[PDB]
Amino acid sequence: LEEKNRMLQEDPVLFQLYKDLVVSQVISAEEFWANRLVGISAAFLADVRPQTDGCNGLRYNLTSDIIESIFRTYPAVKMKYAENVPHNMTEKEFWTRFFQSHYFHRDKENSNAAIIKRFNHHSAMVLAAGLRIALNLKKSDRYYHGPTPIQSLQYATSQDIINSFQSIRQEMEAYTPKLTQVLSSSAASSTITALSPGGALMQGGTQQAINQMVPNDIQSELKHLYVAVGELLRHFWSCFPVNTPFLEEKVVKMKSNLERFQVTKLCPFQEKIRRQYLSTNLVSHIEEMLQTAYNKLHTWQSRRLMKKT
Template identity: 35%
Template sequence: MTTTEDILLQANNVRHKKSDGTLFLMSERIGWLMGSKDTFSVSYKYSDIKMQKISPEGKAKIQLQVVLHDGGASTFHFNAPDGEEAQKRDRDAVKELLQTLLPKFKRKVNKELEEKERLLRENPALLQLYQDLVITRIATADEFWEQHAAEFINKTSCKQDVGVSGAFLADIKPQTDGCNGLKYNLNVDTINSIYKTYPAVRRKFFEYVPGRMSESEFWTRFFQSHYFHRDRINLSSKDLFTDCAKQDEKVIQGELEKDLEDPMLDLRRMTDTTVGDGYGTSTDTPSSSQTNTANISMIRRFNQHSMNVLKASLAAEATAQPAGQPQQNGHASGGEPSAPAGPDLAAKKARLEERTCYADLEAPVPAAGQALSLTKVERYLSGPTPDAPRPAAEPPSADAAGRLCQGVRRWQPFAARVLDPQAAVSVLGDLSPGGALMKTSHKERNAAADLPDQVKTELAAIYRSAGELLRHFWTCFPVSTPALEEKVAKVQDTLHKFHQLKIRQFEDGLCRQAGLGPDVTAHLNQMLAAAYAKYEQWRSVRRLQR
């Protein structure tokens, strides 16, 4: 046992597989040491442990079982000589400490496995490909998820960013704990909303957690702080979030000093004025003494909340915007502001019209009629005139019958161009089913259609898997990078294994069961042969280039 590990708990008289020893709970693993040895006979990391189980009440043996993620398990029998109470006390101490340690070391791999299991369950074609490649050991699981299932993982990895609700803090309803205290239940979305709205709190969190305090203690002090209840007058010097309000005040002051491009927005104005006696023409503004300090603080907090939400949205759009596209507001990166473009002027004009024009006070716009385009006005005024009747043409039936009779009289057979009877019979035999020019008979042509349903299902699965492998193979060409060279070699090797282990076995089964030849898989063999020829051609060209 190494001396560099911190021992959190030591339980003596613990039996494992009928051998006595000592159970140790350390900072990163649990280990059992046989009494006569100096090395651990059993040692598991907390990240490898899935759960723990204890023996039910009333059982003669006081046991604790550790279940691993791979399905394995180890049972420890507490056999203290002081009796059953001491045995239960030792077992409960180990159980409670494991309950505290296991959530901290919960592996993220479990979430990945659950996500992969969900993808296989929701995509039958992907599941069939997994069974054809991974179960038969044609390809490893890592190669499968990296090469053949990357597009499914990329579809699920795109998550929509959740916005910030204006009342997310008000929606956090505390619950009484029965001891004159309040209990707040926070989820991930609420914590992310706090981070977006109050960046200073996010910085404090990473500064103090987990080095100086726990996460629960941090959020308890946050809800008790003056920064959260900022309407309170008294400011404690011991408050953890005292400097957060000062930092936010500096940020707001910096935003006020910037030249805002929106003429309809004035963040410096902290008074709410309405049309008074002067009907909007009076220039008298209330003095600072008449303005309530609480109202000013509230307005500044609302402005800061809106600015933080807009900054988070603009930051997300900036990361999603591809490089080389023009930036907003007509500013070039690192240069002087350019003249506003046409759409900006149109948007500004639309905002001004929205502020100054009211649709309910405007006169109704008359409906525009459809304009007529007349080339001759007199015809439109006088109306259509009936056309003069035309004499009916004589039917050409008599003339056609005469020409047909003359053609029949002059017709002569071309006996020199007609095949002799023996050659005609030979050609007819060659073109009949089973002839020399008809290589497959009608029965053989319908052999694939008469296959059993189970064979059809297996053939369709092989076609899907082969098509997926061939798709990855042909997308590697032209092979222009070392990564593509490595990929085309791996896919080529996978194709050979798939051909030998799946298609060959399927063909042998067809010959034994249905008595069919290789005609059923002829198309599959042609596709694979084309891929093999392409790979050999690429290798020969590559050797010549070297």
């Protein structure tokens, strides 16, 4: 309850989506939520210091991360905290004792032995806490003619082509450069006319500002409906390919949800266009996708029936 509600508050669009899906009786909350569903270092004491501010300030800043690190590395601190805090002593009092205890300020053969033993024990605690095909092608010509289909490579006739090959071979054998014959004023005018704006080569031009034809609120609603449709169709195609009877029932439920979504949200949105008489066929894409899904499902039903005939 509280856990699920907090997720909705994190994503208002999801809450809007959840409102459009479950509140509108389009889908159940059960089917809704069916779709929805640190290292340890040795410096945890050396780096951690009592923070002294500019003027007499002990900013201990007792974060859980350091406390958890100490408890994992030192179960003794955990045991003392459990057996004392907050009954025998308060948590801040325990931390002050730890700061002032000789176990923290370890700082003479006995002292050297104590330091060595403490270092060895610390290393042991850290280590313990760390625990918890040759290929050969056949048809190379497939690469020479890949995804390109068979072109219309029309071949010439009999050896007379050679005569034509001779003709150019004789036509350009005695060649003189020409300048006037290269272009003419009529040819230039025709080329400009082809290149003139709005001409045969200049296809199309400026288009209509569809951004102003679609209201921004309608834009946002279209985006939200697109998100909803995409989620529903992702659930629909996720079942595909169908290999078990459960997928058939899930797809039937998804189709029912899509139909209810179209009835509840799409049509008043459609009327919202029709009342505003928007000429943009924004809904046409959504209708095409929905009809494509319907056709795919019905075709698979036909195939399964034929398999059952």
